[PDB]
């Protein structure tokens, strides 16, 4: 049962991973390569995940080879970076060296 | 005398549209079967969903 | 079940001016909207299905246009004039109008006999009937090709019985055939066997379960 | 791709203000993100819209396992 | 590579949705045997179709497949029979053009073949994409050009009377986004040589003309003998067996 379910529903999960990777910017991804962790999963959760594997369809999201929401979310980071640089410059010019 | 030729219905080459038009594909004699242009509202001056 | 087509599907249309000086013949197959940027063969097939539907060609068929004929009043003329296709009377009228424009005399008696006898049905060596009629090129080519392709599967009854003679079990009673069905019997059967191994190999346990369940439901009641 | 044309007056006598500072994401990026990575992970998964021996199975923890699979 | 997986998944979904709509392509017994596992019927067929990608199983070309292939090939080759061409020409009325005068149409928009050279110079050829992308269409239209790299759909209405031969709509439409060619519908009229009114109207009212290759479905009455064609029908003495079974049940 697990093998049949996994062979039936692997394209959807692969596409989901691709979209999730498309969400993240490059600099944040490079930063996240330094960290490390380990996830502990209960056996019941794993057997439930593989016994009842929901089929995910993203056909509605994709218009040809282009999906909108991922591009929009990725573009917002440029505005974030511009705001970061501008705010840092303004604060540094306003306060200068700081003493404690 | 009789009027052999007096003007008539004239044919013009071009149908110039004054109103600005959104991007599109061919839909006259040539019809494009591909997907219509995808409108993405990129380049937001202020953050909304991030 | 073969379909006997009683009439040839010509598409000739005669267009002539009011003066009658000019005349022309046109083939009407319709206008099909073709797109750009996409492959042309796929659209060609999509339109080809509809074109075959239009001509009565898609479904298996045989031609039965032999009996569409008449005979002339004159006693010498034993020829069989076919009634299908663009009737020679229409072309005669158009040519007469064209000659009426140019002040030429009308078609003579001999020319009229020459023109009105162009479409004819004559027997062939093996018994088939050949009908010569006015028709378009595309319809002619497509109809003839489809006729050949469908004729590839029509076989005599004796040949079919010979082909399936190995698989007849011993206990069952032979079926008598009328002598006509032996001398002149023809059957339309596809004889290529499609392998079921793709489905069986791809999903083995589903097919095994299905066949085993049916077989045991049968056997349990002995 | 080339941009659409504006009005003629906006071409002959048109002026626009602009800024050329692209900026950088390093100040946000450069940090020890060990503690703060998992909240970002949860937000990332929320960004994309989704959706005898056998009776002991329960499916109350599927989304977190799916997120773990994606991150792995 | 990713994106290939995305494309495959989208195409698989489109194929499944299309084949299962209206009358299902697959028989009920096949749906039963695929479903017996417990799937919805669409999922089992989708999995089986995915498993069959890039097979080496031999297949048989049935007669219907050959018929469709023949008709599709003839559709691709002889484009004039189905109301579409692959190149057209646009040139001003003041430039003379060789035309197919067999029929007798007045200002016939049909050419036996598109002129390779006109007035001692080659005729410019432009792709539809480049033509649409253009912004100086006036200068290039001042001489006329051959549009290609597209399938131009057209229609015509051969009217019995005499009159000016002109299109239903304009040849060209200019938008700030791009340039398009409007649908082509010719109003073809026959010709009387001695008609000053019609000659003047054709010379002065119309400023630009559109030329396409002559349709192959058009054929003069004079050469009607080429329409003669033969059809063979099998003998009427043939009797057809509906049930070719060669044996009877015992009881």
Author numbering:
A (entry chain B): 605 to 704
B (entry chain B1): 52 to 101
C (entry chain A): 182 to 403
D (entry chain B): 353 to 403, 433 to 453
E (entry chain A): 705 to 955
Authors' description from the paper:
Banna virus (BAV) is the prototype Seadornavirus, a class of reoviruses for which there has been little structural study. Here, we report atomic cryo-EM structures of three states of BAV virions—surrounded by 120 spikes (full virions), 60 spikes (partial virions), or no spikes (cores). In the full and partial BAV virions, genomic dsRNA segments and a number of RNA-dependent RNA polymerases (RdRps, VP1) are packaged in a double-layered icosahedral capsid consisting of three proteins (VP2, VP8, and VP10).
Asymmetrical reconstruction focused on icosahedral vertices revealed clear density for a non-transcribing RdRp (VP1) molecule near the fivefold pore within the inner capsid shell, and nearby dsRNA is also visible at low contour levels. Only one N-terminal tail of a VP2A subunit interacts with the C-terminal bracelet domain of RdRp, near the C5 exit channel, suggesting that BAV RdRp may be less stable within the inner shell compared with other sedoreovirus RdRps.
